[PDB]
Design an enzyme around this catalytic site. Structure first.
Site, PDB file in Angstrom:
ATOM      1  N   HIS A   1       7.314  -3.356 -13.015  1.00  0.00           N
ATOM      2  CA  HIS A   1       6.499  -2.622 -13.977  1.00  0.00           C
ATOM      3  C   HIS A   1       7.069  -1.632 -15.082  1.00  0.00           C
ATOM      4  O   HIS A   1       6.796  -1.048 -15.325  1.00  0.00           O
ATOM      5  CB  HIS A   1       5.231  -1.791 -13.562  1.00  0.00           C
ATOM      6  CG  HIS A   1       5.331  -0.729 -12.783  1.00  0.00           C
ATOM      7  ND1 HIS A   1       4.364  -1.108 -11.380  1.00  0.00           N
ATOM      8  CD2 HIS A   1       5.299   0.196 -13.248  1.00  0.00           C
ATOM      9  CE1 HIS A   1       4.997   0.089 -10.992  1.00  0.00           C
ATOM     10  NE2 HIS A   1       5.635   1.068 -12.043  1.00  0.00           N
TER      11      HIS A   1
ATOM     12  N   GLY B   1       5.380   8.834 -11.566  1.00  0.00           N
ATOM     13  CA  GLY B   1       6.589   8.550 -11.863  1.00  0.00           C
ATOM     14  C   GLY B   1       7.853   8.233 -10.799  1.00  0.00           C
ATOM     15  O   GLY B   1       8.841   9.132 -10.512  1.00  0.00           O
TER      16      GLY B   1
ATOM     17  N   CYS C   1       7.643   5.794  -8.682  1.00  0.00           N
ATOM     18  CA  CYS C   1       7.738   4.239  -8.063  1.00  0.00           C
ATOM     19  C   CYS C   1       9.045   4.293  -8.671  1.00  0.00           C
ATOM     20  O   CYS C   1       9.724   5.090  -9.225  1.00  0.00           O
ATOM     21  CB  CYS C   1       6.894   2.989  -9.778  1.00  0.00           C
ATOM     22  SG  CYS C   1       5.203   3.544  -9.683  1.00  0.00           S
TER      23      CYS C   1
HETATM   24  C1  LIG Z   1       0.153   6.038 -11.767  1.00  0.00           C
HETATM   25  C2  LIG Z   1       0.909   5.951 -10.278  1.00  0.00           C
HETATM   26  C3  LIG Z   1       0.834   7.056  -9.040  1.00  0.00           C
HETATM   27  C4  LIG Z   1       1.266   6.631  -7.847  1.00  0.00           C
HETATM   28  N1  LIG Z   1       1.401   5.412  -7.974  1.00  0.00           N
HETATM   29  C5  LIG Z   1       2.169   4.781  -8.589  1.00  0.00           C
HETATM   30  C6  LIG Z   1       1.326   4.464  -9.716  1.00  0.00           C
HETATM   31  N2  LIG Z   1       0.903   3.269 -11.095  1.00  0.00           N
HETATM   32  C7  LIG Z   1       0.298   2.735 -10.826  1.00  0.00           C
HETATM   33  O1  LIG Z   1      -0.492   1.995 -10.213  1.00  0.00           O
HETATM   34  C8  LIG Z   1       0.311   1.681 -11.848  1.00  0.00           C
HETATM   35  C9  LIG Z   1       1.349   2.038 -13.128  1.00  0.00           C
HETATM   36  C10 LIG Z   1       0.504   2.825 -13.788  1.00  0.00           C
HETATM   37  C11 LIG Z   1       0.879   2.952 -15.257  1.00  0.00           C
HETATM   38  C12 LIG Z   1       2.628   2.489 -15.983  1.00  0.00           C
HETATM   39  N3  LIG Z   1       2.697   2.742 -16.848  1.00  0.00           N
HETATM   40  C13 LIG Z   1       4.219   1.498 -16.368  1.00  0.00           C
HETATM   41  N4  LIG Z   1       4.365   1.493 -15.214  1.00  0.00           N
HETATM   42  C14 LIG Z   1       2.641   1.657 -14.648  1.00  0.00           C
HETATM   43  C15 LIG Z   1       2.354   0.989 -13.876  1.00  0.00           C
END
Ligand SMILES: Cc1ccncc1NC(=O)Cc1ccc2nc[nH]c2c1
Ligand SMILES: Cc1ccncc1NC(=O)Cc1ccc2nc[nH]c2c1
Lengths: 304, 304
Positions: B41, B143, B145
């Site tokens: 993603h 950020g 991920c």
């Molecule tokens: C926001 C968050 C906080 C903590 N753990 C994970 C996340 N992100 C998600 O759940 C999905 C996501 C959300 C927007 C994205 N844009 C590019 N890749 C993306 C992936």
């Protein structure tokens, strides 16, 4: 989202851990520049610990009696000195992995990470706080002495603790990196009882703010209180008195959440008087006090 | 003595963290040998996450669109491929700090350490468990991920988790390092509700053994039970059924303490039915389930 008891990344500290042996005693040392720091009780046998005269025991030790090993390679000891309750072993090689560092003496209520080590090898990392009675509740077995506590600010490691003793009650005592014990404790196996382990009020309030930020809000109520009124309840429950300095420290969390500090104090007062009623806050069934207001801001903002 | 929620020392993993940017998205990558692993993603915008076609979005990306930075130095991307929900970015330089490693897919109830990172920089380390509903309760902001979960066996790092998603309920979902999600979760921003988060019975029993070893014994009683009887109570309290395999796994703790596994089950059964009555076990007011029997043995024996 989510809020965890988080320790600092330990890599910079792992690069400083060495094994120190003197006679039959082996423990950990901290190698920074060309000095290895370790508890002076490395020179004792378990029998000596009952009534040690450190200056006298030290006279019988020479540089070659302190065996310092970093990984599988031996360090050459070219000097040794006692500073309070720590020994400083001067070695002929500067630790190439020495990070930017400081030695700091923390106050009760402050938190830090501990890298638990055995034989100069890291076993694990956990977060803890200096209790108001100057003990810490760690996880230390025989051979863990010399393991250190620290905080990191970007690339500078501030070392604040070195493990020395386990009291007969199972709580822990140690020194700063200048070798001065926290609290009244001594490096002697004798009756040393800890005082009241009160709860760090300002940290509980910070954690309640973390709970609101991360979705747990059931404990918020329609009440407020004053510092004096709150402190009457704090006294009754063995909580530390809350001062205007603590209120000021909680200002950024109050601003972020829009919940006035005294309103959060009134939520805390009701939690103290009524209990949790079988409910939880951030996965805990007790009021957590090992997160400072700075820790809550750091974790909730993702400081690296 | 003392028993703490301990994470593995994170240094070996810190040496593998890099920043990966694609378009306007920045997250973390894991650099092992000449491959950087990251959530696929990274190629999405927040709008794409509502209904992404990863193969189609990926066609519009070339090697030069994946910006990989290790510290302040840029890595050259010479290939990219999608494996399940992870991208593998082939770089022209092997990570000189690559530790001995394995990729393992853990089972629910297993614990691991997470090195939370932002912009390829480590912020903290904490210990957690793969829940029985295949979620984890971590601490992850935007950020984070690409941050990873791991276990260490002496010098070999077994990577088991890579962070991908936060569900609308604030719990977390991710993949193993082959890019397969744990549980039924997908990398799409849609209704994904988690199942029952049951308690990991075998871990609670291991932690009760740790409590006895470390002095907390008030909950020991004069009773015993059978697996079938215990499991009737476990069902009622949303605890995982205890099997003979779990009893066998607890054998070493039963041998060390002299408390038969079924007698500890009877203590647990009484704790479930009667509650804690305002008492604590190892500083907790709830039954802790994020220590496996192996963790209890490791911590109680000081494995490095
Ligand atoms: C926001 C968050 C906080 C903590 N753990 C994970 C996340 N992100 C998600 O759940 C999905 C996501 C959300 C927007 C994205 N844009 C590019 N890749 C993306 C992936
Ligand atoms: C045993 C232990 C476990 C956890 N934390 C600390 C300790 N050690 C002590 O309390 C003192 C001690 C005891 C024997 C010693 N022999 C040389 N130096 C010694 C120092």
């Amino acid at each position: 989202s989510g809020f965890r008891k988080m320790a600092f990344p330990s890599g910079k500290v792992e690069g400083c851990m060495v094994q120190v042996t003197c006679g039959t005693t082996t423990l950990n040392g901290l190698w920074l520049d060309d000095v290895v720091y370790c508890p002076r009780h490395v020179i004792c046998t378990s029998e000596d610990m009952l009534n040690p005269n450190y200056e006298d025991l030290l006279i019988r030790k020479s540089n070659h009696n302190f065996l310092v090993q970093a990984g599988n390679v031996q360090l050459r000891v070219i000097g040794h000195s006692m500073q309070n309750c720590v020994l400083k072993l001067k070695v002929d090689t500067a630790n190439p992995k020495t990070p930017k560092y400081k030695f700091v003496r923390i106050q009760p209520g402050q938190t830090f990470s501990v890298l638990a080590c055995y034989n100069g090898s890291p076993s694990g990392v956990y977060q803890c706080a200096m209790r108001p009675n100057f003990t810490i509740k760690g996880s230390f077995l025989n051979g863990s002495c010399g393991s250190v506590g620290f905080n990191i600010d970007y690339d500078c490691v501030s070392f604040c603790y070195m493990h020395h003793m386990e009291l007969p009650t199972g709580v822990h005592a140690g020194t700063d990196l200048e070798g001065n014990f926290y609290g009244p404790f001594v490096d002697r196996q004798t009756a040393q009882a800890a005082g009241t382990d009160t709860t760090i009020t300002v940290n509980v309030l910070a954690w309640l703010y973390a709970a609101v930020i991360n979705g747990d809000r059931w404990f918020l109520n329609r009440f407020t209180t004053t510092l004096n009124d709150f402190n009457l309840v704090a006294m009754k429950y063995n909580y530390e008195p809350l001062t205007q300095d603590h209120v000021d420290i909680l200002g950024p969390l109050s601003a972020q959440t829009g919940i006035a500090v005294l309103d959060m104090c009134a939520s805390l007062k009701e939690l103290l008087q009524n209990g949790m009623n079988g409910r939880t806050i951030l996965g805990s069934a007790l009021l957590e006090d090992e997160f400072t207001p700075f820790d809550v801001v750091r974790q909730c903002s993702g400081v690296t």
